[PDB]
Point group: C3
């Protein structure tokens, strides 16, 4: 099972555990992740869903260049549409969760490997965490909700600049931009911080939390759903163009 | 007695909350008088500004009173709740759609909707000693009186979730950092002078141009707010039918 | 004599404002030339970026000139005003919907629409010495050339109302703080090398991917802006019929 699940004190922990691809995003992990998010969402008794990685070195490597290359080489678009469908549903199901959603970024989180977590209510990173948005050099458009979330979180102009620079950036920079909400210095502090955070969530009333999130989001989930569809079409179109195959090959 | 006073001075309408019994708390009686004052100001062609303030040193507004909310949770029907939400939502919408420059002066504490209604104003100025509270999380209710519309637009979604989770009394400095207020004055005298100067700057403008400017800047937002207020109403009414809310209000 | 020059260099179109007669003022003449330059750039498959700049050290653009505005105000038909708005509004929209990376280099002062049109660009870079002005409040007019769309989205509603109310000449530092510009360069030469480096970074990408990226990020905003430009025109036209506007322009 590409992801592990456990409920403790009325909170669901979803742990990415896919060493073969370093927590990479493909159709199989995606399907397993989606199932887990949906189970948490449908679980009346929990108040929170925590997304995390089991592996010290990384949170998620994101979509794998090797896997993308296969999609570029595929002339049917089926492989590409397949993986995007599942991962897009993961993003949407996180975004529309009635539970308080938190992502714990312990290690590096590249591309969609970070971006999917932008759908969470809060993102907390270890100091050592590193981030990367590499669409520009790859010759592709942003996906997995990135075109929706980035401008809304950090602003359009800063999004264009972040994508243009395509740098490995620090947790400090991510905090400054508002991509993440806070930084913990080490594993133990993160562990304590999370415990305290969930204690605070538990003092609320589950249906009130759900209504609150619903009201705050308003028409956003409808907008995101539409944007995910547009991202899909733009990316598929680009993946039919030789330049994209060439860049993926080179990489 | 009347709990909302009105006065025009030099082409500015001053709306003053005066409800000491309930510390300027929000109920249908105050709401009704407040709405009437807001509309009268919006319909007055000579004024360029509307100033909302409290006549009482200790507090701006305690917001909807716990005891009153407890009554609504105890009610047999939802008629009382819908009635007060109706009047107070209209206050919010009528401030928001005012053609006049709207300013709220937060002198003392402003809790829940006692503060949140004023988020519809063009500018919010607080005394340093002002304190603020958003306590929906512990109360087990959803945000109302526009708070679900204004908070994420002003401070961001992530920040709104965290503010609500913490439910702490917070300072004017914190309110300023978040953008909930636009500036702080240290005392009543300084505030009185600042307002004088600010209204002077406003008066140098042209009333119809000011109205056109506000209309353009807001675009479709007024319709969106109106719809959101309706949704807040339905969500809150649904929660007040659940025994947990009565239990929670009863304990507080 | 053409008031807008174009040159392609390093896979980028440089559009240069060269209108000393009006200190790079915005009229239908310069506007027509600028629009042609923008469209040419947007349809040029061999470039990745469009750079907008001024040839003159003293100013970027003095914006719509008071003298020209007065003429429109004194005119008994709305045709000349609607004609200039039509072309300039198209410049704004066509910058905003450009598939190329768009950068404005603000070297000297930029007043009103002279700055505001550039808010449609992906990046605004100013020389430290640049100065800015939004003077709608004193002029008695509503914001135009997209300003009513861009200002609240970039700096916030409350901050926009205050910016307009104060109508002060402000520094590049303040522009940067507000988010109206993205960065500051100390001098012409550093700016030249910065732009060179920036364009190199852009060139590392793939033109159709840049275009698709911008299209996705913008979503429905292009249609929103187009409608909003139409609203700005409708309101400005109504105000220019009023005696107060002519009086204020003359005074100025």
């Amino acid at each position: 099972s590409y992801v592990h699940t456990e409920i403790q004190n009325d909170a669901l922990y979803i742990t990415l555990d896919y060493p073969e691809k370093k927590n990479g995003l493909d159709a199989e992990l995606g399907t397993s992740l989606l199932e887990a998010i949906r189970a948490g969402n449908n679980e009346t008794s929990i108040h929170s869903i925590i997304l995390q990685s089991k592996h010290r070195a990384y949170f998620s490597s994101g979509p794998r260049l090797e896997d993308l290359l296969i999609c570029a080489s595929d002339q049917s678009d089926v492989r590409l549409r397949e993986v995007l469908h599942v991962l897009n549903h993961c993003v949407l199901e996180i975004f529309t969760s009635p539970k308080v959603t938190v992502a714990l970024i312990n290690g590096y989180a590249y591309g969609g490997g970070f971006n999917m977590m932008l759908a969470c209510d809060r993102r907390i990173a270890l100091r050592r965490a590193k981030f990367l948005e590499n669409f520009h050099k790859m010759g592709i458009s942003p996906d997995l909700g990135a075109s929706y979330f980035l401008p809304r979180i950090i602003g359009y102009e800063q999004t264009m600049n972040l994508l243009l620079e395509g740098k490995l950036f620090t947790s400090e920079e991510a905090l400054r931009l508002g991509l993440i909400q806070e930084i913990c210095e080490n594993k133990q502090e993160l562990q304590e911080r999370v415990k305290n955070y969930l204690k605070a969530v538990s003092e609320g009333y589950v249906p009130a939390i759900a209504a609150t999130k619903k009201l705050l989001k308003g028409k956003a989930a409808e907008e995101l759903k539409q944007q995910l569809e547009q991202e899909t079409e733009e990316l598929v179109a680009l993946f039919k163009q030789t330049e994209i195959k060439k860049r993926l090959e080179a990489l």
